[PDB]
């Protein structure tokens, strides 16, 4: 008969074979990152390679089927998933070389460490050690030492790896009919043949710039404010007309600046919105954090969790012998086994992260109504945005009012409003030019607009142009400040979180749209409003059943990425920023340097 009936039979075979094998692979990787031993990491690439080669096995068994035969959009977007050869298509030495450089970066980034120059026993890795000094030390020389050292120890040693990686990976992307590897990145957002719901690869560049022009004034005033408070916290170090030094950014490079908050607080004698003291003093544990997150999911209109969730997850750190990695992720194992990997301390950041990862698990259970190749994100933006929704509403004072913290006769002046909004705004505003600059840098490198001897020079020029951040000590091309980060050497897409930051406030206004909230978005709580979670659950039950613009219309009614809700979230704070920065310098100069002072 026809090819599409036997294609249905083939996809039946492939799903009911592949779910069990990927479940075994994800359990093996899970019981490595929860039981770190040799047998467990060799399990991580036993059923892991048994899955990775199975992709190419059923790709070749699916690339027999010609692509231009398909009428059903379901098996169309399925065949576009199987027929994608991925990183398996190179000349035979280059594929294993590319896999070698990937795992080599993934090892020496994670186990590389810096050391005290006069005594080589005082050594610290990235996590912990260096992420605490960049976030909590108040010393120029200490932060600048860790700053220079993390780029000198591993970044120089990650520089030739990324140097061969750009040629190998751009060659692979040209081998899969893409322009560069940035084009391979933007091809995830790209969709084909949807007629009014299409999306091209250059449209991502156009839209990210089209909203980054809509981030520049807010970031201009916020960068002026945090520049003034970093001058006041670090005297004789920072010029009023210059940028920020890259070691005083709260972290190592400039992604999250919320650790400036204790020195960039607006009003330090009003009660702080961070309920960390209320969590530790009133004695809840991590299990109470996650159960209160689940009851928030019941309040917003969503059902409870699976048995594999509360039975087989590792929500906390065991500490000793059964040691586990502590990065909060939501692993999607299938078979109803959707878990949160986390080392949860008694922390409001961990509270919002509990809502966040359980938002991921909620989106996983929502697209669980599919078969497995539609059991994923539509794009690389919906998963993390549905995560950050529950945290952002859960950050609001109306949430902390109705949880059991924040003793209920709490004041709602403009004082603590500007405090909380600027606390949010450090993170949300400062993550945007760093994202645009990092992805624009890597797109320029993967295209080849930045030469092989100008990665580090044009790197600092983009740090000054976009983020407005200078280096305190300069760098030649021996260093590599992108590749010494988690996102560049370990091959993580990073514009996905930019799109997240847009979809975050979009979905936040659509969930506060039907919830009938009185004030603006920043006091809005979707708890006790079933229509908010049901409105996220109508778009959430798609998964990769549709292209992402149709689901974007299914939240707000639009086709394109927009930041107007973030404008409605930050605009009273934005005018407050403009009134506080009428006596602070408006702009940054690309000539200033703490070594050139």
């Amino acid at each position: 008969s026809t090819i599409e009936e036997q294609a249905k039979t083939f996809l039946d075979k492939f799903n009911h074979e592949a779910e069990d094998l990927f479940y075994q692979s994800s359990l093996a990787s899970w019981n490595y990152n929860t039981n770190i031993t040799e047998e467990n990491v060799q399990n991580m690439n036993n059923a892991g390679d048994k899955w990775s080669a199975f992709l190419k096995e059923q790709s070749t068994l699916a690339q027999m089927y010609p692509l231009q035969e398909i009428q059903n959009l379901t098996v169309k977007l399925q065949l576009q998933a199987l027929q994608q050869n991925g990183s398996s298509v190179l000349s035979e030495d280059k594929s294993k070389r590319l896999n070698t450089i990937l795992n080599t970066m993934s090892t020496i980034y994670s186990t590389g460490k810096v050391c005290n120059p006069d005594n080589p026993q005082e050594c610290l890795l990235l996590e912990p050690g260096l992420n605490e000094i960049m976030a909590n030390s108040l010393d120029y020389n200490e932060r600048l030492w860790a700053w220079e050292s993390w780029r000198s120890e591993v970044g120089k040693q990650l520089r030739p790896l990324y140097e061969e990686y750009v040629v190998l990976k751009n060659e692979m992307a040209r081998a899969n009919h893409y322009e560069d590897y940035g084009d391979y990145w933007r091809g995830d957002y790209e969709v084909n043949g949807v007629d009014g719901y299409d999306y091209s690869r250059g449209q991502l560049i156009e839209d990210v710039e089209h909203t980054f022009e809509e981030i520049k004034p807010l970031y201009e005033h916020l960068h002026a404010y945090v520049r003034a408070k970093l001058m006041n916290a670090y005297p004789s170090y920072i010029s009023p007309i210059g940028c920020l030094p890259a070691h005083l950014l709260g972290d190592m490079w400039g992604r999250f600046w919320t650790n400036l908050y204790s020195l960039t607080v607006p009003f330090g004698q009003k009660p702080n919105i961070d309920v960390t003291d209320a969590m530790v003093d009133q004695a809840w544990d991590a299990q109470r954090i996650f159960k209160e997150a689940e009851k928030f999911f019941v309040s917003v209109g969503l059902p409870n969790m699976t048995q594999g969730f509360w039975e087989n997850s590792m929500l906390t750190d065991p500490g000793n012998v059964q040691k586990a990695v502590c990065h909060p992720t939501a692993w999607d194992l299938g078979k109803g086994d959707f878990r949160i990997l986390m080392c949860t301390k008694v922390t409001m950041d961990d509270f919002l992260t509990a809502h966040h990862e359980m938002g991921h698990i909620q989106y996983d259970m929502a697209y669980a109504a599919q078969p497995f190749l539609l059991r994923n994100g539509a794009n690389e933006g919906f998963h993390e945005a549905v995560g950050e929704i529950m945290s952002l509403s859960a950050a609001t004072p109306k949430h902390l009012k109705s949880i059991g913290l924040l003793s209920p006769d709490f004041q709602e002046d403009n004082e603590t409003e500007i405090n909380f909004l600027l606390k949010q705004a450090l993170t949300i505003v400062g993550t945007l030019p760093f994202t645009y600059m990092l992805e624009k840098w890597r797109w320029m490198v993967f295209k080849g607009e930045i030469p092989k001897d100008q990665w580090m020079k044009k790197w600092w020029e983009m740090k000054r142009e976009i983020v407005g951040v200078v280096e305190p000590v300069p760098h030649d091309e021996t260093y590599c400040d992108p590749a010494s980060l988690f996102h560049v050497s370990n091959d993580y897409s990073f514009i996905r979180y930019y799109t997240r930051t847009l979809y975050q406030f979009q979905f936040q206004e659509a969930l506060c749209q039907a919830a009938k909230h009185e004030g603006p978005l920043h006091k809005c709580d979707i708890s006790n409003s079933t229509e908010a979670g049901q409105k996220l659950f109508n778009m959430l039950r798609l998964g990769k059943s549709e292209p992402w613009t149709l689901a974007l219309e299914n939240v707000v009614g639009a086709k394109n990425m927009n930041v107007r809700p973030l404008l409605n979230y930050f605009e009273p704070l934005f005018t407050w920023l403009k009134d506080q920065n009428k006596n602070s310098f408006v702009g940054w100069s690309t000539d200033w340097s703490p070594y050139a002072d």
Partner: protein
């Protein structure tokens, strides 16, 4: 625990209590092929039952008790002591 499987490949539905067994290789157009052939697959495959499956993939033993209706008289299960009086009856 992979000692329980199922069929997802058949040329139509089942008649009343036709117990399909067959270990005959499936292809949707007749045509008994030879696996690993093209579009001539295996009809029987696994379940994937783990105890680490939560609520979602629990293995359930199902007993179906066909209560047939008086084609023959009473077999399934259904002392009245009265003498010298006119009462209604049923015996075995």
């Amino acid at each position: 625990n992979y000692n329980y499987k199922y069929r997802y490949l058949r040329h139509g539905k089942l008649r009343p209590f036709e117990r399909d067994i067959s270990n005959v290789p499936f292809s949707p157009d007749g045509k008994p092929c030879t696996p690993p052939a093209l579009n001539c697959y295996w009809p029987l495959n696994d379940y994937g039952f783990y105890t680490t499956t939560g609520i979602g993939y629990q293995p359930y033993r199902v007993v179906v008790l066909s209560f047939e209706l008086l084609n023959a008289p009473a077999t399934v299960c259904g002392t009245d002591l009265i003498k010298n009086q006119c009462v209604n009856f049923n015996f075995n």
